[PDB]
């Protein structure tokens, strides 16, 4: 009927999910378990194109609203990934952050990194989309790549940047960036 994706991805969502909202959770594995709601369980390219046009835009959510699209249900937590980094992408615009996602999120779920860059090897099985404004950008959204391993950052950082010239956004409209784990 439909064509399977890889992997299927989950996909869930931790509302205004801040540094000091964790100040009322004292512990993060007890703020994950009592804020994140699950919404879906992408196992198509139908289901994942229906999902992403779905999905209500970051900005218009709290700051901190993320949305995680994990591998196999997998836990996006830091220690589950100790070799590896999350390559950041801020995008400006909520007009250029919906081409942004697009790419972003065919690029992992559609297994482009994986062939393009890994040479086969699943080194993403995270993708995190937070609303983070700024007093300047208020509007401005977050994409969070996660790699099992950040010897792969330097060759996912020209990918992902590469792409984003191709899918329409000039330099102004998005900065790369790295945060190890
Ligand atoms: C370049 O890299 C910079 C830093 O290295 C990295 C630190 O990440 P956060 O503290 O945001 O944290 P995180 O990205 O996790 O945010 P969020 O997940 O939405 O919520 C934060 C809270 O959630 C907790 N948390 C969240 N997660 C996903 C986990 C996890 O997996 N494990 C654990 N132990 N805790 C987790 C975390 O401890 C904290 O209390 O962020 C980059 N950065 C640079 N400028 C900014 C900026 N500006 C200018 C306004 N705002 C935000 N981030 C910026």
């Given amino acids: ?39 879906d369980y992408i196992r198509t390219v139908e289901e994942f194109w229906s999902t992403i046009n779905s999905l209500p835009k970051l900005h218009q959510l709290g700051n901190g609203s993320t949305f995680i699209f994990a591998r196999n249900n997998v836990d996006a937590s830091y220690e589950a990934f100790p070799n590896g980094t999350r390559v950041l992408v801020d995008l400006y615009k909520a ?28 080194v993403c099985d995270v993708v995190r989309l937070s609303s983070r404004p700024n007093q300047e950008s208020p509007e401005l959204v977050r994409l969070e790549v996660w790699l099992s391993d950040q010897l792969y950052a330097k060759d996912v950082i020209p990918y992902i940047r590469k792409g984003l010239n191709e899918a329409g956004l000039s330099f102004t409209d998005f900065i790369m960036g790295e945060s190890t784990f």
């Fill in 1 to 39: 009927t439909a064509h399977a994706l890889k992997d299927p991805w989950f996909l869930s969502y931790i509302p205004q999910l801040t540094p000091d909202t964790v100040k009322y959770d004292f512990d993060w594995n007890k703020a994950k378990q009592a804020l994140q709601q699950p919404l």
């Fill in 95 to 122: 007009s250029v952050a919906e081409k942004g996602m697009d790419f972003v999120l065919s690029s992992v779920l559609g297994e482009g990194l994986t062939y393009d860059v890994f040479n086969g090897k699943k």
